[PDB]
Design a protein around this ligand. Structure first.
Ligand SMILES: CCCCCCCCCCCCCCCCCC(=O)OC[C@H](COP(=O)([O-])OCC(O)COP(=O)([O-])OC[C@@H](COC(=O)CCCCCCCCCCCCCCCCC)OC(=O)CCCCCCCCCCCCCCCCC)OC(=O)CCCCCCCCCCCCCCCCC
Ligand SMILES: Cc1cc2nc3c(=O)[nH]c(=O)nc-3n(C[C@H](O)[C@H](O)[C@H](O)COP(=O)(O)O)c2cc1C
Ligand code: SF4
Lengths: 430, 56
């Protein structure tokens, strides 16, 4: 199929996204969950990993790495140490709400995916590191986990199989950087949320020094339905190498900001006009869009006209598909102030380990504040571009890249706006 | 500069050359000792961009 979108409700993988249909275990069994899971576990780890590889599911964390290959990193025999699955329920990126929605409205999908992924890797426990601000979501997840333990779906007989698994929930304490892979591992281990270098990879040294695999909530939540319904089906959705369904959050200046499940490779304009009710004032009033959450740069209306919603499509459009969090800005907004607020966010949420990210993102925050006021000079635009290029690729984790990229997008597209602000400031202060 | 016409004529004739045009005592044509403040220019490599030290 050349065109994508208009996903069928019977093909929606995240039924009960809107809080109906009794999120507890009885409603999960009515909607279809924990079905043939014993058959899946007895079918075994190699079959599950081959199912993931044939489905072609990619990380849904924003990373974009092939889930099947990443999970098949740990198909080794035993070492002496246990193995762990870790789920990232931190969801700290601006624009992103999908993990919160699925944890509070269909948590048994997350629990079943923890069990299936833990069996696929070969493991004894899944630590769900949830965000600290999601107290009600964490309590609902604990209610679901207690119901699964009472039903015998976890612990000493995984759904009647001879596999032993445990599911723990550990809450954060308010750090966006703890959504990172190794920083989350450190936060579980009880230190500060500072990411560690790679190598060693988490598949060799993770939490407590054990082989671990860190996976997104949406990834593990679509995992057991991928195993159950094939994977050729999941690859049938979406384009080549960008396959399946995706939870798009749409926020900002849209008529109905909402979280909706939609097929991959759907047009941005089609997605907004079909699910968000359109831009406030119209598609002509649309100025810019951030398609990923906050780590991805801007795309203006001109390229937003025809862009698709793939990793490859946004890479071609000099952006990325991160958490699929379409932030929409119409013409009646301060785009420089929005980008400066994003740099404020990255300055406040930097963990402070690397000198590049630490000092450079503080520097970016000050330069962007002066850009918003107008008291800069047009040479400082290229100076800020070089500061961004110095930050990017020179840090331990990708928060430095995710702070450099919105600056690069703003400089790339809305440079006459910055120059206009500077000349207006200069002529009004002289 | 403060010499009579007869003495100037005698000096010019004795020297063979005109002396009042190029006399070796400085009176007023020199610069004032108090000068306005300068504003010295910055040279190249003050560019704030495309100015890595490894390229120069
Ligand atoms: C002499 C020393 C004491 C006086 C010093 C004094 O008060 O000087 C003030 C003053 C000079 O100060 P000044 O204003 O800076 O000089 C004017 C010109 O720049 C001076 O420049 P100038 O060389 O053009 O003027 C010299 C002028 C005047 O020269 C004379 O009168 C010298 C005597 C000529 C005979 O000569 C002439 O008029 C032509 C003389 C031609 C001679 C051949 O007046 C004089 O010196 C007048 C002449 C005094 C001659 C005194 C002769 C006797 C001396 C004592 C003998 C015992
Ligand atoms: C600063 C930073 C914040 C991140 N926050 C999250 C987050 O909130 N949730 C998430 O699932 N991944 C987050 N990630 C990306 C993780 O590296 C990625 O999700 C993790 O490797 C799980 O892989 P997956 O996408 O294949 O499931 C973040 C990365 C960085 C650098
Ligand atoms: S890039 Fe920033 S947030 Fe990431 S490890 Fe370095 S100092 Fe910490």
């Amino acid at each position: 199929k050349t065109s994508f979108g208009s996903l069928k409700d019977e093909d929606r993988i995240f039924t009960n996204l809107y809080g109906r249909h009794d999120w507890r275990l009885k409603g999960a069994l009515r909607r279809g969950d924990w079905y043939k899971t014993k058959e899946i576990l007895l079918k075994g780890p190699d079959w599950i990993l081959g199912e993931m590889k044939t489905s072609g599911l990619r990380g849904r964390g924003g990373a974009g790495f092939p889930t099947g290959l990443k999970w098949s990193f740990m198909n080794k025999p035993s070492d002496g140490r246990p193995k762990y699955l870790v789920v990232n329920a931190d969801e700290g990126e601006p624009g992103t709400c999908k993990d919160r929605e699925i944890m509070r409205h269909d948590p048994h999908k997350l629990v079943e995916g923890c069990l299936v992924g833990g069996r696929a890797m070969g493991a004894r426990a899944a630590y769900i590191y949830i965000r600290g601000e999601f107290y009600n979501e964490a309590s609902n997840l604990q209610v679901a986990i207690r119901e699964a333990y009472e039903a015998g779906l976890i612990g000493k007989n995984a759904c009647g199989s001879d596999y032993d698994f445990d599911v723990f929930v550990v809450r954060g304490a308010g750090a966006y950087i703890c959504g990172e892979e190794t920083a989350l591992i450190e936060s579980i281990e009880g230190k500060q949320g500072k990411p560690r270098l790679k190598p060693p990879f988490p598949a060799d040294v993770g939490v407590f020094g054990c082989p671990t695999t860190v996976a997104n909530v949406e990834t593990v939540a679509v995992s057991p339905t991928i195993c159950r319904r094939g994977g050729t089906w999941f690859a049938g959705f979406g384009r080549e190498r960008n396959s399946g369904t995706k939870l798009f959050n749409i926020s900002g200046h849209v008529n109905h900001p909402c979280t909706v499940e939609e097929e991959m490779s759907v047009p941005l304009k089609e997605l907004i006009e079909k699910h968000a009710g359109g831009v406030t004032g119209g598609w002509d009033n649309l100025l810019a869009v951030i398609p990923g959450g906050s780590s991805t740069p801007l795309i203006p209306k001109s390229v937003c006209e025809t862009v698709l919603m793939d990793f490859d499509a946004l890479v071609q459009a000099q952006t990325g598909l991160g958490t699929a969090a379409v932030i929409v800005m119409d013409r009646s907004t301060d785009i420089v102030k929005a980008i400066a607020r994003l740099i404020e966010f990255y300055k406040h949420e930097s963990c402070g380990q690397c000198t590049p990210c630490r000092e450079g993102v503080d520097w970016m925050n000050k330069v962007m504040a002066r850009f918003v006021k107008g008291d800069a000079r047009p040479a400082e635009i290229d100076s800020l571009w070089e500061i961004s290029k110095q930050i990017e690729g020179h840090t331990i984790c990708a928060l430095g890249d995710g702070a450099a990229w919105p600056v690069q997008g703003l400089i790339r597209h809305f440079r006459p706006e910055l120059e206009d602000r500077m000349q207006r400031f200069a002529q009004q202060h002289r | 500069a403060s010499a009579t016409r007869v003495i100037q004529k005698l000096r010019n004739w004795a020297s063979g050359q005109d002396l009042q045009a190029k006399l070796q005592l400085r009176y007023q044509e020199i610069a004032k000792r108090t000068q306005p403040p300068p504003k010295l220019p910055v040279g190249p490599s003050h560019k704030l961009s495309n100015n890595y030290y490894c390229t120069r």
